[PDB]
Amino acid sequence: QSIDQLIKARGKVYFGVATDQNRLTTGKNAAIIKADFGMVWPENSMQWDATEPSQGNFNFAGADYLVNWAQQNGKLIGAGCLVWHSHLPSWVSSITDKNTLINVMKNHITTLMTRYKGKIRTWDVVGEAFNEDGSLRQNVFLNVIGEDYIPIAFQTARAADPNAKLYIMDYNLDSASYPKTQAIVNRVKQWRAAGVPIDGIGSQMHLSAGQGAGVLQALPLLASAGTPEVSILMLDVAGASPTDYVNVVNACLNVQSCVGITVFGVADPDSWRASSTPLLFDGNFNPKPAYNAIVQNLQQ
Ligand SMILES: O=[N+]([O-])c1ccc2nn[nH]c2c1
């Protein structure tokens, strides 16, 4: 039973998964994505270090493959991250002139979004912009440009492809009483009041066992920023307990602006934390108990 079909029947847009070329040609990933998921995201192939490893010299072979495959198989596409300290090649971090870095950032955003204009439902524009205490993270963009880099990034993205939904994403937004969760709400409200085109907040959700219950309170709090959409991104759950996964799905169903959920890969052995067996399919590509629990929850 397809969890994407079932979540669409409950009024949501998609159940998605991260993947890339060499996943689609190995294992049983392509068969499972075709049958059970409605949206694909490039795991790595759209990140800055993969797409612009030297200034102005773009690498699109891997991203092109994924976009083509998705179109051929009737899947939605999400993409990112346009601006994210974690995947930044060294040539960018060494820039010290404000105008140069603004131009570099704009060129990166505009080139990627133009190439796929009209084909991408959701773009993650800015990622991991916050410290755990809710202050802004001191990456090269904040240090050189200042806090205006976030408004500039979103304004540039909206002009490059007005059809795309534009998101800011971060992790550790999973507790309603954690400072980072209220801080991104505070800032996003302020930015949208200033006309910044932030369409969504994406929660990069890497949970430990038992943390699913708190998302029932955290996700409505993220929705109080007033963005048109919120999403769950890069989802995995240590231990893959049905209770944790069902709580995450119900948080999505409870929040009217939450459009869908993307899990961070298909099968456990291909996870960044495989020893925590945190995904919905096991190392033989069999659905795990959490997968069947989601199915039953969505049919209930
Ligand atoms: O939802 N995702 O799995 C996912 C993976 C990589 C990304 N880069 N930017 N946004 C992303 C979302």
Author numbering: 4 to 303
Q: Any passages from the paper?
A:
HG3.17 was evolved from HG3, a higher-activity mutant (S265T) of the in silico design HG2 that was engineered post-design to reduce the active-site conformational heterogeneity observed by molecular dynamics analysis of HG25. Over an evolutionary trajectory that yielded the HG3.3b, HG3.7, and HG3.14 intermediates, a total of 17 mutations were introduced into HG3 to produce HG3.17, resulting in a catalytic efficiency increase of approximately three orders of magnitude. To evaluate changes to the HG3 conformational ensemble along its evolutionary trajectory, we solved room-temperature (277 K) X-ray crystal structures of all HG-series Kemp eliminases, both in the presence and absence of bound 6NT.
In this pose, the acidic N–H bond of 6NT that mimics the cleavable C–H bond of the substrate is located within hydrogen-bonding distance to the carboxylate oxygen of Asp127 (2.5–2.6 Å distance between heavy atoms), while the basic nitrogen atom corresponding to the phenolic oxygen of the transition state forms an H-bond with either a water molecule (HG3), the Nε atom of His50 (HG3.3b), or the side-chain amide nitrogen of Gln50 (HG3.7, HG3.14, HG3.17). In addition to being held in place by these polar interactions, 6NT is sandwiched between the hydrophobic side chains of Trp44 and Met237, which are part of a mostly hydrophobic binding pocket that also includes the side chains of Ala21, Met/Cys84, Met172, Leu236, Thr265, and Phe/Met267, as well as the backbone of Gly83 and Pro45. From HG3.7 to HG3.17, no further changes in catalytic residues occurred during evolution. Yet, catalytic efficiency increased by approximately fivefold. However, rigidity continues to increase at this position between HG3.7 and HG3.17, even though the side-chain rotamer of Gln50 in the presence of bound 6NT remains the same.
